[PDB]
């Protein structure tokens, strides 16, 4: 694929920075790292199922990926695909589980992460 032309390099240190925050939050209580379930998907061999229900798979490694790659190219079409893999998580899994409500969670945390970010970037 022809490689696409470089984002702004404050829009991708953003990028890059609201992410890391999602990656890195853990519940307050418990010290438990969310994310940890959505680094990595199954293989289509290990869980060919997955692949069958849900048409545009993605995961954190994928997203950081595609930041680097200038797929994105506003933190709108960053938001989009953080919350298709929130979406995709809550299609497979049942509500009341673990990773569906991680999932839900998350994307709370990225529309809080981005919010301080867009903050204090305003100067
Ligand atoms: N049940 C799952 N639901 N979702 C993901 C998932 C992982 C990364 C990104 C999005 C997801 O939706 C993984 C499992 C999973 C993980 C390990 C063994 C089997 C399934």
Same mark, same amino acid.
């Given at each position: 694929? =022809?490689?696409?032309?470089?984002?702004?390099?404050?829009? !991708?240190?953003?990028?890059?920075k609201?992410? &890391?925050? /999602? #990656?890195?939050?853990? $519940?307050?209580?418990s010290?438990?790292? @969310?994310? *940890?379930?959505?680094?990595? @998907?199954?293989?289509?061999? =290990?869980?060919? *199922?997955?692949? =069958?229900?849900?048409?545009?798979?993605?995961?954190?490694?994928?997203?950081?990926?595609? #930041?680097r790659?200038?797929?994105?190219?506003? @933190?709108? $079409? %960053?938001?989009?695909?953080?919350? @298709?893999?929130?979406?995709?998580?809550? !299609?497979?899994?049942?509500?009341?589980? %673990?990773?569906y *409500?991680d999932?839900?969670? %998350?994307?709370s /945390?990225? !529309?809080?992460?981005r919010?301080?970010?867009?903050?204090? $970037? &305003?100067?």
């Amino acid at each position: 694929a =022809e490689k696409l032309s470089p984002n702004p390099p404050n829009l !991708t240190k953003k990028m890059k920075k609201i992410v &890391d925050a /999602v #990656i890195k939050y853990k $519940d307050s209580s418990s010290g438990r790292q @969310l994310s *940890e379930v959505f680094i990595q @998907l199954p293989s289509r061999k =290990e869980l060919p *199922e997955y692949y =069958e229900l849900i048409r545009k798979p993605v995961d954190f490694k994928k997203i950081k990926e595609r #930041i680097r790659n200038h797929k994105y190219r506003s @933190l709108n $079409d %960053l938001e989009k695909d953080v919350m @298709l893999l929130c979406q995709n998580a809550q !299609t497979f899994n049942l509500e009341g589980s %673990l990773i569906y *409500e991680d999932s839900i969670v %998350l994307q709370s /945390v990225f !529309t809080s992460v981005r919010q301080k970010i867009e903050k204090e $970037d &305003d100067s």
